Amino acid sequence: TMITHHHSIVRRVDDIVWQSDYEYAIKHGNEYDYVISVAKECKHPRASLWIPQDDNVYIPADRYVTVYNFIKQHDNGKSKFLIHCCAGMSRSVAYSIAYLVLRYGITVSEAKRRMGINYMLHPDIEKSLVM
Amino acid sequence: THHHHHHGSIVRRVDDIVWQSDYEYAIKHGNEYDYVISVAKECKHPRASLWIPQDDNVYIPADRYVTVYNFIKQHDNGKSKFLIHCCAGMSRSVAYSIAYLVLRYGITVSEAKRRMGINYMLHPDIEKSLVM
Numbered sequence: 001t002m003i004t005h006h007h008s009i010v011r012r013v014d015d016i017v018w019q020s021d022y023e024y025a026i027k028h029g030n031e032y033d034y035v036i037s038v039a040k041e042c043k044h045p046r047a048s049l050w051i052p053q054d055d056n057v058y059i060p061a062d063r064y065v066t067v068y069n070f071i072k073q074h075d076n077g078k079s080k081f082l083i084h085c086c087a088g089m090s091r092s093v094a095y096s097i098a099y100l101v102l103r104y105g106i107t108v109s110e111a112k113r114r115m116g117i118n119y120m121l122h123p124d125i126e127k128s129l130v131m
Numbered sequence: 132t133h134h135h136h137h138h139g140s141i142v143r144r145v146d147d148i149v150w151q152s153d154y155e156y157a158i159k160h161g162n163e164y165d166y167v168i169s170v171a172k173e174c175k176h177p178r179a180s181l182w183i184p185q186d187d188n189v190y191i192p193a194d195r196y197v198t199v200y201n202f203i204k205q206h207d208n209g210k211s212k213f214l215i216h217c218c219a220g221m222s223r224s225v226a227y228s229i230a231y232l233v234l235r236y237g238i239t240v241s242e243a244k245r246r247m248g249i250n251y252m253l254h255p256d257i258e259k260s261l262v263m
């Protein structure tokens with residue numbers, strides 16, 4: 001018999017950085033000076049920075065540092081940054097946590113608390129966040 | 132904004148003794164048939180009398196078309212109904228049904244399509260396979 005069903009994530013990271021899913025980034029990307037796509041399969045058409053990142057795998061520190069460096073070096077006190085993946089639960093949350101850790105010298109727990117992340121990412125992503 | 136997952140259950144008459152369908156029809160009406168023939172790898176009827184592990188969108192070797200034609204001819208005792216099904220009922224089971232009609236009745240692919248009301252081209256490699 002016929003079935004009728006339906007199947008947007010955005011979180012503030014700090015004063016200057018937001019984290020989202022692809023849907024939010026497409027609909028609201030123009031509200032940001034810089035869009036950072038950290039999913040291989042969800043590359044914003046006007047992404048300033050794209051890391052072709054697979055999900056559910058260990059993320060090397062050099063990727064975390066590339067994104068942190070990108071934000072810090074373009075932080076002119078007037079710029080807003082959006083980090084997004086596809087569903088906005090795994091890859092963009094990890095890069096966002098890593099940015100907070102690298103920039104403010106806080107723990108992974110404290111980063112999550114600030115962003116309101118109350119879950120565990122893929123074991124291998126959580127491992128990657130202990131740099 | 133919501134979306135719909137419509138029901139299948141599509142069935143075409145092939146000849147006096149043979150019907151062609153999607154998996155949904157085969158599941159819900161299988162018991163109305165003496166012999167269910169499954170010609171999809173991934174849609175094997177739990178009471179299939181014959182199963183060909185056929186992938187879609189590929190050349191079908193003559194050997195397979197002949198296996199199905201022979202199976203129906205051999206079990207055609209004047210008292211038996213046959214159902215040939217794949218998954219969506221538009222490609223693999225249509226190709227095997229067309230090949231059965233060509234082999235048994237010496238008509239053309241185009242005439243077999245006409246009888247069955249097939250107003251479309253199958254995958255190019257399937258169309259190649261039907262020109263035996």
Ligand code: NI
Pocket residue numbers: 005007134136
């Ligand atoms: Ni759906």
Ligand code: NI
Pocket residue numbers: 133134135
């Ligand atoms: Ni509707």
